[PDB]
């Protein structure tokens, strides 16, 4: 019941702001992200809302998150001062030019979300600014050829999420959606990342590099050579994301975790050390939020 879920969120968010409106943007992000720790993981938490054509999951919620919706929700709350401005900020962060539709949703972290949110002045990629002791960057470039029409072509009825179950209506709407998807663009990503070969040079954590990751930064997990063409219809470059949060002079990765089943804090060093054994995960991208005070289309 998407309308009911949103109504619960309206009440909780209104109250949140009453507390907040009585600090730096990084501290806002830390406080708001912390407020949702322990909230359950829901894969694909958000859609286009009640009565939506393709995906009738709620537009926002406070009862569950996936990695993407957690970051989007926290950022939009941090950027705003009210339920009304949050709604506007979220719309403009989740969708290209804030125009609500399935195809306008920022589905791909690199070529949609990073690109559009950088262009409008919300985010800045600072990956290359994290330099070794000789003041030289250690970052590399990950590329994936993101083929939207092939990604659409690979979709099943599971994409079509209707509140009232109707399998035939799912089939109809899927053909309609794919017809639009066929007209979309193909984009080669260019995603800076700090490689594990640097972060764990000599098989130990590179504390000099880790110390340059700012509190409240957005951390994306990068897989440079990730061929998901047979599985989802496209190569991909980014598999997960969350926030960098410093607590007691230790760096945490705060994120909505499918493994833990909830929003958790985990040591970023330990998390990445375990991720090293992956054949496809090769490093991290770091972005910071530019707006200094809360207010939402452009900055």
XYZ file of C-alpha atoms in Angstrom:
299
model
C 0.000 0.000 0.000
C 2.164 2.721 -1.407
C -0.078 5.614 -0.392
C -0.084 4.409 3.238
C 3.681 3.961 3.236
C 4.150 7.513 1.953
C 1.709 8.832 4.571
C 3.778 7.241 7.333
C 6.885 8.853 5.819
C 5.178 12.276 5.677
C 4.512 12.081 9.426
C 8.077 10.908 10.277
C 9.807 13.435 8.000
C 7.682 16.359 9.235
C 8.770 15.417 12.779
C 12.403 14.974 11.786
C 12.544 18.567 10.520
C 10.905 19.938 13.647
C 13.855 18.429 15.541
C 16.470 19.474 12.964
C 15.237 23.041 12.504
C 15.610 23.798 16.222
C 25.427 22.567 11.442
C 27.614 21.655 8.453
C 26.231 19.631 5.538
C 28.569 16.735 6.407
C 27.192 16.713 9.970
C 23.616 16.810 8.629
C 24.391 13.795 6.430
C 25.952 12.008 9.408
C 22.997 12.720 11.711
C 20.300 11.844 9.168
C 22.069 8.728 7.902
C 22.480 7.616 11.565
C 18.772 8.156 12.287
C 17.932 5.338 9.848
C 20.486 2.780 11.099
C 18.786 -0.582 11.681
C 16.028 0.024 9.104
C 15.419 -3.112 7.058
C 16.737 -3.754 3.573
C 14.155 -3.834 0.786
C 15.423 -4.528 -2.723
C 14.064 -1.882 -5.138
C 12.488 0.118 -2.298
C 11.018 2.960 -4.392
C 9.005 3.429 -7.557
C 6.995 6.190 -9.238
C 4.233 6.084 -6.610
C 0.543 5.261 -6.386
C -1.169 5.080 -9.772
C 2.179 4.916 -11.591
C 2.188 3.363 -15.070
C 5.067 0.883 -14.591
C 6.233 0.840 -10.970
C 3.732 1.666 -8.202
C 6.134 1.295 -5.292
C 6.222 4.416 -3.067
C 8.064 7.590 -4.070
C 9.756 7.693 -0.642
C 9.537 5.713 2.604
C 11.116 5.335 6.041
C 10.431 1.628 6.672
C 13.009 0.135 4.267
C 15.888 0.993 1.916
C 18.142 -0.430 -0.735
C 21.658 0.930 -1.260
C 20.511 3.508 -3.841
C 17.331 4.655 -2.104
C 19.180 5.056 1.201
C 21.717 7.448 -0.299
C 19.033 9.337 -2.259
C 16.761 9.678 0.762
C 19.535 10.799 3.140
C 20.962 13.346 0.666
C 17.537 14.815 -0.115
C 16.671 15.126 3.616
C 20.058 16.740 4.289
C 19.621 19.234 1.459
C 16.116 20.314 2.507
C 14.487 22.021 5.513
C 10.938 20.691 5.297
C 8.819 17.777 4.062
C 7.860 19.901 1.017
C 11.434 20.808 0.036
C 12.525 17.178 0.695
C 9.917 15.974 -1.793
C 11.230 18.414 -4.392
C 14.894 17.589 -3.715
C 14.204 13.863 -3.901
C 12.305 14.213 -7.181
C 15.250 16.121 -8.697
C 17.855 13.660 -7.370
C 16.000 10.477 -8.426
C 14.885 11.634 -11.884
C 16.514 13.482 -14.764
C 15.340 17.145 -14.478
C 12.871 16.094 -11.771
C 10.461 14.760 -14.398
C 8.862 11.661 -12.871
C 8.804 8.593 -15.117
C 10.310 5.122 -15.261
C 12.626 6.021 -18.155
C 13.727 9.286 -16.498
C 14.643 7.525 -13.251
C 18.400 7.652 -12.641
C 18.760 3.860 -12.909
C 22.499 3.728 -13.620
C 24.742 5.101 -10.909
C 27.427 6.263 -13.342
C 25.866 7.544 -16.554
C 22.600 8.702 -14.962
C 22.970 9.472 -11.257
C 26.581 10.634 -10.991
C 26.352 12.460 -14.338
C 23.118 14.355 -13.701
C 23.770 15.138 -10.044
C 27.255 16.446 -10.859
C 25.904 18.526 -13.762
C 23.335 20.218 -11.535
C 25.906 20.964 -8.841
C 24.904 18.531 -6.106
C 27.971 16.265 -6.290
C 31.665 16.602 -7.071
C 33.903 13.615 -7.843
C 37.034 13.970 -5.705
C 38.543 10.506 -6.368
C 41.672 11.867 -8.083
C 42.310 14.343 -5.229
C 43.119 11.429 -2.923
C 46.853 11.337 -3.528
C 49.874 9.363 -2.293
C 52.706 10.814 -0.178
C 54.354 12.230 -3.326
C 51.184 14.267 -3.990
C 50.279 12.285 -7.071
C 46.874 10.720 -7.653
C 46.638 6.934 -7.600
C 43.241 6.722 -9.357
C 42.418 4.777 -12.530
C 39.418 4.839 -14.909
C 36.676 2.224 -15.054
C 34.534 2.064 -18.193
C 31.366 0.169 -18.947
C 29.385 0.424 -22.147
C 25.869 1.019 -20.819
C 23.454 -0.067 -23.526
C 20.003 1.116 -22.388
C 18.027 -0.468 -25.246
C 19.588 -3.877 -24.553
C 18.994 -3.465 -20.810
C 15.315 -2.738 -21.559
C 15.131 -5.700 -23.930
C 16.286 -8.041 -21.141
C 13.530 -7.009 -18.713
C 10.813 -9.347 -17.486
C 7.378 -8.723 -15.969
C 9.163 -8.319 -12.582
C 9.934 -4.763 -13.677
C 6.219 -3.974 -13.712
C 5.089 -3.587 -10.115
C 1.338 -3.019 -9.824
C -0.531 -2.779 -6.525
C -3.497 -4.752 -7.870
C -2.080 -7.984 -9.361
C -2.826 -8.437 -13.086
C -0.309 -10.566 -15.025
C -1.825 -9.692 -18.425
C -1.668 -5.991 -17.613
C 2.009 -6.551 -16.653
C 2.738 -8.059 -20.077
C 1.008 -5.182 -21.910
C 2.832 -2.488 -19.971
C 6.178 -4.274 -20.359
C 5.892 -4.219 -24.201
C 4.979 -0.540 -23.970
C 7.944 0.219 -21.727
C 10.342 -1.762 -23.950
C 9.129 0.136 -27.005
C 10.243 3.342 -25.312
C 13.483 1.738 -24.051
C 14.451 0.816 -27.645
C 14.811 4.550 -28.472
C 17.243 5.305 -25.645
C 20.952 6.024 -25.705
C 24.165 4.028 -25.224
C 26.846 5.614 -23.033
C 30.386 4.624 -22.191
C 31.034 5.443 -18.553
C 34.251 7.047 -17.282
C 34.402 6.407 -13.558
C 37.494 7.310 -11.556
C 38.436 4.813 -8.849
C 41.148 4.334 -6.272
C 42.379 0.774 -6.841
C 42.840 -1.857 -4.116
C 46.431 -2.212 -5.339
C 46.916 1.288 -3.857
C 44.611 1.114 -0.834
C 46.208 -2.165 0.230
C 49.733 -1.719 -1.145
C 52.107 -4.170 0.605
C 48.975 -6.038 1.861
C 48.282 -3.436 4.548
C 45.716 -0.602 4.675
C 47.152 2.607 3.216
C 46.266 4.931 6.050
C 47.470 7.998 4.156
C 44.919 7.394 1.390
C 42.060 6.379 3.706
C 42.566 9.512 5.848
C 41.700 11.758 2.864
C 38.168 10.402 2.479
C 35.966 13.212 3.929
C 33.223 12.703 6.491
C 29.845 12.506 4.715
C 31.320 11.557 1.334
C 29.467 9.158 -0.982
C 31.477 5.953 -1.618
C 30.720 3.833 -4.704
C 32.030 0.311 -5.181
C 33.601 -0.083 -8.645
C 33.796 -3.124 -10.909
C 35.724 -1.990 -14.055
C 35.279 -5.138 -16.093
C 31.836 -6.415 -15.193
C 30.179 -8.152 -18.095
C 26.510 -8.576 -17.213
C 25.384 -8.573 -20.865
C 23.974 -12.085 -20.832
C 22.310 -11.533 -17.449
C 20.850 -8.012 -17.523
C 21.603 -6.953 -21.094
C 24.471 -4.594 -20.381
C 27.969 -4.207 -18.980
C 27.982 -2.454 -15.637
C 30.495 -0.496 -13.555
C 29.111 0.183 -10.039
C 27.670 -2.490 -7.708
C 27.008 -0.703 -4.402
C 27.205 2.613 -2.556
C 26.892 4.288 0.829
C 28.414 7.020 2.994
C 31.851 7.509 4.520
C 31.338 8.341 8.191
C 34.190 9.084 10.643
C 33.431 8.025 14.248
C 36.021 8.138 16.989
C 38.789 8.632 14.405
C 37.796 5.408 12.582
C 36.235 5.337 9.115
C 32.912 3.560 8.581
C 30.919 2.622 5.501
C 27.297 3.377 6.325
C 24.932 1.651 3.901
C 21.806 -0.387 3.323
C 23.203 -3.901 3.206
C 21.538 -6.924 1.587
C 24.031 -9.108 3.481
C 23.091 -7.690 6.913
C 19.440 -7.162 5.929
C 19.448 -3.585 7.212
C 21.209 -0.200 7.251
C 24.514 -0.787 9.060
C 27.892 0.765 9.896
C 30.891 -1.414 8.982
C 34.620 -0.580 9.135
C 35.439 0.691 5.618
C 38.959 -0.796 5.773
C 37.619 -4.229 6.837
C 34.788 -4.094 4.278
C 37.163 -3.366 1.392
C 39.739 -5.874 2.632
C 37.060 -8.589 2.342
C 35.973 -7.170 -1.042
C 39.562 -7.598 -2.361
C 39.030 -11.333 -2.852
C 36.378 -10.566 -5.489
C 37.501 -11.176 -9.072
C 35.481 -8.130 -10.261
C 35.582 -5.496 -7.488
C 38.725 -3.366 -7.970
C 38.248 -0.172 -5.946
C 36.198 2.848 -4.900
C 34.919 6.206 -6.217
C 34.493 9.167 -3.852
C 32.098 12.103 -4.258
C 31.265 14.995 -1.951
C 28.122 17.087 -1.629
C 28.671 20.701 -2.705
C 25.775 22.734 -1.250
C 26.840 24.136 2.146
C 23.398 24.815 3.601
C 19.937 23.281 3.198
C 17.230 24.985 1.118
C 16.455 22.319 -5.310
C 16.747 21.713 -9.066
C 20.182 23.284 -9.616
C 22.933 24.655 -7.367
